[PDB]
């Protein structure tokens, strides 16, 4: 059953590691489980329901222990599919992966906690919550979209901060005496931040009509400047998704790769100028196909087609001229 064993091992590795479809459902389950623990912790804080919260939390934590331990061991076993993790040394290197190290250490620390330990339990719960990512994908995506719009976010922050400072100062001037809310410029700054973000507690609000007019005038644009980052990032995310959907179809990374591997094999077997030159050529084509993944490839295709057709027309001209001479 070695074939069936290998099939099962590959399926387990795929579901535990990067999944594609219904495999994600499993993760959801475990995620909910760990999420549940987190929620129960919060409930343990309320003294009204602390007893029942802790009673459920103990068994939920032990269940988390069992699930995470079995998942970790299954992941270690299923790491054999990839070549880089084979045998004692290979699987030891696999356990050397940062997230596998995090998983094993959190498992052991939680086990020890089972054997004021509550704070450690809460910290471990949040630690597993953050480890749920397992790849940094969310952070990578957010950082990419933010850095792409770094100039826009910076200008939004700069102008919004200037608006906040100026509006807070003017309202403070208009409300310094006739209102205890704006006793100090720090209070006015707190008010300005709370309003321009549109949180608006109501603990501080202008009461003098001059202050009200100034606050109206400034918030009317400050709220927009403060809401700008949300819109900028949302539009950036949507455009990134749309372009990913469009680029999902082209699949123009195939021929350069085959050429690259063939040329590398030929040059390796050579051991000459043509072989090495062609290897460099094929690597060049490989990476030049890697980069664009966009409409620049299409413009390159138009340029190639047009220049080729022009060359064929020049050949036509030569042929017709020579025929006329004949």
């Amino acid at each position: 059953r070695n074939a069936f064993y290998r099939k099962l091992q590959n399926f387990l590795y795929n579901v535990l590691e990067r999944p594609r479809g219904w495999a994600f459902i499993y993760h959801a389950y475990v995620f909910l489980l760990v999420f549940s623990c987190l929620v129960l912790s919060v409930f343990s804080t309320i003294k009204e329901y602390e007893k029942s919260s802790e009673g459920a939390l103990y068994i939920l934590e032990i269940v988390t222990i069992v699930v995470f331990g079995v998942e970790y061991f299954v992941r270690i076993w299923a790491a054999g599919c990839c070549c880089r993790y084979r045998g004692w040394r290979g699987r030891l290197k696999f356990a050397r992966k940062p997230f596998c190290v995090i998983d094993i250490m959190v498992l052991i620390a939680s086990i020890a906690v089972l054997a004021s330990a509550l704070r450690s339990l809460r910290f471990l719960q949040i630690l597993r919550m953050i480890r749920m990512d397992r790849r940094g994908g969310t952070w990578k995506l957010l950082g990419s979209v933010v850095y792409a719009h770094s100039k826009e976010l910076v200008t939004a922050w700069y102008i919004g901060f200037l608006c906040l400072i100026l509006a807070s100062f003017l309202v403070y001037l208009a409300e310094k005496g006739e209102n205890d809310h704006f006793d100090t410029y720090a209070d006015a700054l707190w008010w300005g931040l709370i309003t321009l973000t549109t949180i608006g507690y109501g603990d501080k609000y202008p009461q003098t009509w001059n202050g009200r007019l100034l606050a109206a005038t400034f918030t009317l644009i400050g709220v927009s400047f403060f809401a700008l980052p949300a819109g900028i990032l949302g539009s950036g995310f949507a455009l990134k998704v749309q372009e990913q959907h469009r680029q999902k179809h082209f699949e123009k990374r195939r021929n350069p790769a085959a050429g690259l591997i063939q040329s590398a094999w030929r040059f390796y077997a050579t051991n000459r100028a043509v072989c090495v030159m062609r290897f460099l050529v094929s690597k060049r084509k490989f990476k030049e196909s890697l980069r664009p993944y966009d409409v620049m490839d299409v413009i390159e295709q138009y340029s190639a087609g047009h220049l080729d057709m022009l060359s064929r027309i020049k050949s036509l001209q030569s042929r017709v001229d020579q025929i006329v001479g004949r």
Partner: protein, 143 residues
């Protein structure tokens, strides 16, 4: 070595038909046509761009020796080969099936003779499992 430099000079003279030390694209095209197949203008211009280290359209003999000095391991071309094999690794398990491998070699990109793919299945398949690996394979090519 002395014989190594002598054979490089012989190869350059066969290549640089002019003999002035300034190899041109047309000489590459002619000698390659002698080798059997036809190179394109864009192909040759990319070749000259890759080999040239001065920016005048011609390569001097010291530059030719320098580009010959780069070995497979020295060039550090590992990443490109691994990522290409992963691109072919439709399953991504670290191994590539023999059927798909042969189909790709003999039917995709630069059509490759059955002899070369036979040599691949021979040398690369140390374990003979059909699901031939490409990581250890590129390691031994590097070595």
């Amino acid at each position: 070595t002395e014989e190594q430099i002598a054979e490089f000079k012989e190869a350059f003279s066969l290549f640089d038909k002019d003999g002035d030390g300034t190899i041109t694209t047309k000489e590459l095209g002619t000698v390659m046509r002698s080798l059997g197949q036809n190179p394109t203008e864009a192909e040759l211009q990319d070749m000259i761009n890759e080999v040239d280290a001065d920016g005048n359209g011609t390569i001097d003999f010291p530059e030719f020796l320098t580009m010959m000095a780069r070995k497979m391991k020295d060039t550090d071309s590992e990443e490109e080969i691994r990522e290409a094999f992963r691109v072919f690794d439709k399953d991504g398990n670290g191994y590539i099936s023999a059927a798909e491998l042969r189909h790709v070699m003999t039917n995709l990109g630069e059509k490759l003779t059955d002899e070369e793919v036979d040599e691949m299945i021979r040398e690369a398949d140390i374990d003979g499992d059909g699901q031939v690996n490409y990581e250890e394979f590129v390691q031994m090519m590097t070595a």
